Scaffold this active site. Structure first.
Site, PDB file in Angstrom:
ATOM      1  N   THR A   1      48.330  54.580  66.610  1.00  0.00           N
ATOM      2  CA  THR A   1      48.827  54.463  65.355  1.00  0.00           C
ATOM      3  C   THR A   1      50.298  54.834  65.268  1.00  0.00           C
ATOM      4  O   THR A   1      51.003  54.019  64.760  1.00  0.00           O
ATOM      5  CB  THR A   1      48.079  55.102  64.162  1.00  0.00           C
ATOM      6  OG1 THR A   1      48.047  56.515  64.222  1.00  0.00           O
ATOM      7  CG2 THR A   1      46.658  54.609  64.229  1.00  0.00           C
ATOM      8  N   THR A   2      50.381  55.867  66.024  1.00  0.00           N
ATOM      9  CA  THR A   2      51.965  56.373  66.171  1.00  0.00           C
ATOM     10  C   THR A   2      52.824  55.519  66.926  1.00  0.00           C
ATOM     11  O   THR A   2      53.878  55.288  66.396  1.00  0.00           O
ATOM     12  CB  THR A   2      52.004  57.813  66.497  1.00  0.00           C
ATOM     13  OG1 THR A   2      51.087  58.626  65.794  1.00  0.00           O
ATOM     14  CG2 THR A   2      53.524  58.258  66.599  1.00  0.00           C
TER      15      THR A   2
ATOM     16  N   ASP B   1      48.229  63.229  64.104  1.00  0.00           N
ATOM     17  CA  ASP B   1      47.747  61.811  64.008  1.00  0.00           C
ATOM     18  C   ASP B   1      48.405  61.147  62.838  1.00  0.00           C
ATOM     19  O   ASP B   1      48.594  61.320  61.817  1.00  0.00           O
ATOM     20  CB  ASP B   1      46.263  62.006  63.314  1.00  0.00           C
ATOM     21  CG  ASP B   1      45.156  60.808  63.807  1.00  0.00           C
ATOM     22  OD1 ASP B   1      45.043  60.497  65.112  1.00  0.00           O
ATOM     23  OD2 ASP B   1      45.031  60.033  62.923  1.00  0.00           O
TER      24      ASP B   1
END
Lengths: 521, 486, 521
Positions: free
Chosen positions: A87-88, A54
């Site tokens: 988010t990545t 994550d």
């Protein structure tokens, strides 16, 4: 021309520093994109270890040396709170956007012209989602593909099928009446002494401390649960008196005199037990949060009463909704109004510890997801995955529209933006080209992590065209093209929507940085 | 130890020029960002010229004077801080006359002061009047600052707040049109609600909270008073003269301890305390009350008759005391509502600068063409006026004109267009065509008339901008000996 | 992994060394492209200065420090030998081809894949060139546009009209009836004592050595040209004898008998002069390459002959084919059949020296272009521009097809390559895209040297689209698009044809370089 204790990069080197930081942060997180991606370790220094793909945990909990990269780390904290995913990939697009911008800035192009191209491509990119979004009705099979698409990116492809059916049913247990889904209705509990694949759902709440006495019923099929917050242990004098003793024996008399404050109330529990359906084929349960003396636990156990102690405030509120008994702050005013009702209340036995379970509730409007794992870090790993899987199904139901995955939208939006000319100026055509080639980093990176050639995979999915609306994505196992709809690979609409709005804003602001001045560093 | 000679003036130029080169690109709607590295690694990408120099610690005394003057400019005027430093730095960057030609500073100062009087004379010719009575016309001017803000959702409410609040403080009877936002237009934040609930209160507000219920909830004629055994008796008498008048609220300047609040609570009145002297003067003008030396000398005339009403209504988990009226007692108060403190802070500073814009426009209803049009227009006048300037002062007199071109220069640089090509064609337009128009487009980058684009700025902002830049350049040039001494 | 006294670059960094050299050589020569481009100086070290824009001179005569860059210099030599133009544009395309390839090679792409795309882009680009070429008839109005386009790139926009009419007329005099052409028919002379703008044509030929006697005729309006190679100075005894003397005077008396062999042959010259139109209003000229005695010159001078001596092999060569006089290697066989004929023959006196001119010939199949300038390097600069201008008019006449200039062909071919799907391999299109972007360096550099924005100029000419043949170029004075065929800008078909063949071969071979080894260095 400068003052002491001051430094400033007046030329375009400020961009070369910020652009270099994004490229470095791009190369770090690109290896953990998707299920085939590798994992990153998080050493806290004290010896703790935590593995996770994550991106928010790799940016929120981890520490970064570059000051410029810490700005993008705060963005992931914002991206996580709104959508819960992306988010990545948000960091990859920022790095590739800034990479393509540096290619044109070296040719003498102003940064502000590139940002205008992003704002034009972004508005066109958002409209493309509305055309390709599939407003499929939420069902079990659809949410399984969505939860599988989210959970496979955080586990070893073994807990996916196990956690998928649990995460799907957790939302469906709380999803009804067209109500807004609240994640506070699902509490997450962890347990050691078992393997990782033993994770399953609990229809009701789970408590840490349970009944500890031989004379207790191992399972209570039904009971009038009494909610209370009064300690049945040795307490201070509650009347207009005090403690005055002359020796250890006279002090013991005060304990006998002070214990009468509870002994009259412990029998009060026996009274309401016999009162409200005290006949055969009935039961009674006490969920008093505060401490309870072993005498009261020994006394009530003879009457066949399961009494609990040392619970949390949040559990007591959930317990009242599950049962119905309102909390009594003083045993003197006891009545049947403070009682509830529940089904099977048993005790789960582990190797050393034991836990209380209140399954088979009537109308709790709340459930619990019991996590089990052998290691401590594995519990935190699975917890972060379920929290991401829950938000994935939440966004799919809160926003009934979904979109394909496997970089199929990025490959499609790239071809759409190329077939779109500006309306404000001609030089914005370059910024649109940078936005088009930036979105292709996702299907490029997915080919790298899967062990396939970056160029062969992208050229196949990009060359695949037909005389109809056709989707196409990267097959992580074969490397060939893949229609995401025909396999069950779906993303959320708000994730891709917030992605374009987030990357464009930060890649813009980073390009508008003309100078970097030290404020007395 | 000590620095004298041409080394001083050459150093002050490099200092003021360095401070100006930092914020060259923070001008206009395309304000480029600046990355300030904190010692702890913290970074802020702000693009406000004030906050940038505020946090940058400098050592040169000349650079500090250039910064402190912009700070003083920020208080008197809510705009033009970045233009003062760029012009003051560009006016000083022409060192061809100071060192190569050995012109004395008194010769250049005679030229800079002569240009300032002519620069001011040229602005008033290109000015344009304003119909301030029209709310939509003045609304078109305040939208320049409301753009790219949170108040753009209800900008019509944002303008009506500042526009009327300034006009209420506007005392036109005395001729000079004195306006004081900080004095007569006190602003306070109110938790709860939204931006739409922001309104104006026709009087003074007290943010104290109600501690006990023995207080006046609603009164038609507020009687606002303004002023262990031994402590009880000395307090028992000072409170006796107050309650004898049968008041509705007692606002004492100094503190009211617990025993003093006890006797006041027996009279069932609101206990207010910890208020300043000027606040008491504003309270007295709100209702016509009288400030007295001590409670002993209180008289029957010490009343707040004529006021609207007293109210202690709880609004959003907080009690608020009002002594407002349905008239205009030379003041007002902005009650800014908001669902959170994050939104309340933005609206406070946003509307504050909006009141400064209406303050300058209403002090003199005369605008000027922005977007470099005023600079290039003024520069054309000096270049023509210098042709009849017999003397050696003609050379620095013309240099001041070319220094004003920096404003359209930076606006064109941020847009990414060719600076020389547009600035060359821009100067030609002011020669042939009218000088009141043909400026620069800060959003597009090409040339455009200011009659078609409402970038019209006030006149007082430019006058104090050029006056402060010239006076600042004249200041540092007069510095020829930096010496220590305690 | 290497032997001592040597070095080896194993990894792909050896390729980056060659890419960096071409990028550097690109930035050197880009400033001298076109008329508005700057000039480069060639300091020979001895003290000779030389200014020129000809890329062949800036690579052949200028020695290059970098080893890799010297290879590309040898190709510019080969490029100049075939077409005589395009050496500068060849290096700029090579520098951009290798630049664009590095963007994809850094992503893990093999060089051999990119080179296969260049071979595909070359054939597509070569076929499109056949469509753009204009096969119109070559007239004086057209060759002036070619000569101006070629000469502007080597002069200060002042010798344009001066050298244009001379360069064009010099070619038209040496071609008729579709005959093969040869530039060696035109002689290039240089003379001082006059301004640079004093250049003009010479229909005849210029000779170095003049007549030496006071009674010579400064101009001969008509004469028969007698070619000779016999030394009319003192020669040895032609019979089997020696030097049988008793003093110095007796030795001198035998020299008189030795001069009988030459002195009588001077009478044979005077005989044929009086026979072949030795009447009034006539003349006679002798062009004997060897020397002539002063006393013998007195005989021919009094008869009105303009004699010449000590000529060069090149002068006698052109004098024969121009005038037709056959070389007589011995005056014994003197006859009128070997005599030529010519019109005006005069010696123009300069401030320092003199030169003989033989103008007003019928069809000598040879002419001369007389260049005049104040300095030495200026004459060399004009000599190079004329040879580049003549070869440009040669190519347009031989190859009757011409193509537009100002980067209009490069912009059109680049649009054609982008509108070309893969046909040899899927990944080959990455090289086709690199080939497309490489061609756009030509209009980009023309915008830089003219002082305009690199991006605005290229985007405007790219936006020009219509339902008809439309080829726009870079206006160096305006910057806006410009139809190169309308304004009178025309390039050769062999120049653009050889660029694609030369750029692809070298950019390919440099990409195939895997290691750089020292062969005993």
């Amino acid at each position: 021309t400068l003052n002491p204790k001051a430094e400033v990069a007046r030329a375009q080197a400020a961009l070369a520093v910020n652009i270099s930081a994004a490229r470095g942060l791009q190369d770090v997180l690109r290896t953990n994109l998707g299920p085939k991606g590798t994992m990153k370790m998080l050493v806290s220094g004290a010896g703790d270890i935590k593995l996770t793909k994550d991106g928010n945990v790799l940016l929120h909990e981890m520490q970064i040396q570059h000051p410029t990269a810490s700005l993008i780390a705060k963005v992931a904290t914002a991206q996580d709170d709104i959508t819960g995913d992306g988010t990545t990939s948000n960091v990859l697009i920022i790095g590739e956007l800034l990479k393509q911008a540096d290619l044109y800035i070296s040719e003498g192009l102003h940064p502000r012209i590139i940002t205008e191209g992003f704002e034009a491509a972004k508005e066109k990119a958002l409209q493309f989602l509305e055309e390709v979004k599939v407003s499929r009705e939420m069902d079990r099979e659809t949410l399984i593909d969505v939860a599988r698409t989210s959970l496979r990116t955080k586990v070893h492809a073994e807990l996916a099928d196990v956690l998928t059916e649990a995460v799907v049913d957790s939302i469906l247990a709380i999803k009804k009446q067209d109500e807004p889904i609240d994640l506070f209705m699902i509490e997450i509990m962890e347990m050691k002494h078992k393997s990782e694949t033993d994770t399953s759902l609990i229809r009701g709440l789970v408590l840490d401390h349970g009944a500890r006495h031989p004379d207790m019923k191992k399972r209570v099929e039904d009971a009038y649960i009494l909610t209370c917050n009064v300690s049945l242990e040795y307490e201070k004098t509650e009347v207009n008196s005090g403690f005055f003793y002359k020796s250890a024996e006279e002090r013991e008399k005060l304990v006998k005199a002070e214990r009468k404050f509870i002994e009259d109330r412990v029998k009060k529990i026996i009274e309401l037990k016999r009162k409200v359906c005290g006949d055969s084929d009935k039961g009674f349960v006490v969920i008093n949060q505060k401490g309870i003396d072993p005498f009261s636990l020994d006394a009530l156990s003879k009457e066949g009463i399961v009494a609990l102690r040392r619970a949390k405030r949040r559990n007591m509120e959930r317990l009242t909704l599950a049962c119905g008994g309102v909390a009594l702050n003083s045993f003197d005013d006891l009545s049947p109004d403070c009682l509830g009702h529940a089904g099977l209340v048993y005790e789960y036995t582990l190797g050393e510890e034991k836990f209380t379970f209140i399954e088979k509730c009537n109308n709790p409007r709340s459930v619990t997801l019991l996590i089990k794992g052998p290691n401590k870090h594995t519990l935190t790993q699975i917890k972060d995955a379920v929290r991401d899987g829950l938000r994935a199904v939440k966004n799919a139901i809160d926003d009934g529209c979904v979109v394909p995955g496997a970089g199929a939208v990025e490959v499609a939006m790239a071809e759409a933006l190329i077939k779109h000319k500006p309306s404000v100026k001609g030089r914005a055509q370059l910024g649109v080209q940078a936005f088009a080639d930036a979105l292709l980093i996702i299907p490029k990176v997915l080919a790298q992590n899967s062990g396939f050639d970056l160029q062969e995979t992208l050229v196949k999915i990009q060359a695949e065209h037909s005389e109809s609306g056709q989707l196409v994505g990267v097959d992580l196992n074969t490397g060939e093209p893949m229609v995401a709809a025909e396999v069950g690979v779906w993303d959320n609409y708000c994730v891709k929507k917030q992605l374009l709005h987030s990357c464009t804003v930060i890649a813009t602001n980073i390009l508008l940085v003309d100078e970097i001045m030290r404020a007395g560093m | 130890k000590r620095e004298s000679g041409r080394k001083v003036q050459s150093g002050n130029i490099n200092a003021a020029k360095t401070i100006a080169d930092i914020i060259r690109t923070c001008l206009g709607p395309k304000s480029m960002m600046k990355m300030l590295l904190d010692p702890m690694g913290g970074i802020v990408m702000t693009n406000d010229g004030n906050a940038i120099l505020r946090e940058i610690q400098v050592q040169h005394p000349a650079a500090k004077s250039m910064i402190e003057i912009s700070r003083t400019q920020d208080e008197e005027v809510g705009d033009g801080t970045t233009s003062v430093i760029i012009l003051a730095g560009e006016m000083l960057s022409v060192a061809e006359h100071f060192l190569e030609q050995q012109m004395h500073p008194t010769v250049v100062i005679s030229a800079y002061r002569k240009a300032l009087d002519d620069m001011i004379s040229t602005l008033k010719k290109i000015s344009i009047p304003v119909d301030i009575s029209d709310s939509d016309m003045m609304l078109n001017i305040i939208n320049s600052s409301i753009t790219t803000k949170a108040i753009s959702r209800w900008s019509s409410l944002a303008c009506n707040i500042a526009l009327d609040a300034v006009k209420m403080v506007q005392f036109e009877e005395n001729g000079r049109k004195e306006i004081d936002i900080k004095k007569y237009a006190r602003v306070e934040k109110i938790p709860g609600g939204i931006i739409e609930d922001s309104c104006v209160l026709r009087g003074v507000m007290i943010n104290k909270d109600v501690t006990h219920p023995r207080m006046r909830r609603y009164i038609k004629n507020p009687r606002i008073v303004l002023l262990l055994q031994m402590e009880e008796e000395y307090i028992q008498q000072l409170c006796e003269d107050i309650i004898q008048l049968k008041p509705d609220v007692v606002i004492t300047e100094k503190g009211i301890s617990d025993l003093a609040q006890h006797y006041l609570m027996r009279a069932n009145i609101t206990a207010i305390r910890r208020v300043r002297k000027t606040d008491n003067n504003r309270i007295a003008r709100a209702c016509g009350a009288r400030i007295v030396s001590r409670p002993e000398e209180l008289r029957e005339d010490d009343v707040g008759t004529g006021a609207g009403l007293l109210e202690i209504k709880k609004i959003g988990d907080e009690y608020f005391t009002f002594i407002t009226d349905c008239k205009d007692p030379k003041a007002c108060t902005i009650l800014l509502r908001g669902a959170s403190k994050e939104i309340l802070s933005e609206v406070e500073r946003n509307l504050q600068d909006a009141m400064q814009v209406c303050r300058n426009v209403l002090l003199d209803p005369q605008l000027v063409p922005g977007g470099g049009a005023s600079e290039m227009a003024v520069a054309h006048a000096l270049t023509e006026k210098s042709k009849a300037m017999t003397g050696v002062e003609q050379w620095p007199y013309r240099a001041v004109a070319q220094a004003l071109e920096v404003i359209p220069r930076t606006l064109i640089q941020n847009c990414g267009a060719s600076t020389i090509r547009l600035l060359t064609s821009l100067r030609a337009k002011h020669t042939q065509e009218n000088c009141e128009t043909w400026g620069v487009n800060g959003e597009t980058g090409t040339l455009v008339d200011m009659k078609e684009l409402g970038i019209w700025e006030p006149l007082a902002v430019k006058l104090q901008t050029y006056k402060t830049a010239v006076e600042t350049a004249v200041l540092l040039l007069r510095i020829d000996d930096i010496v220590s001494g305690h």
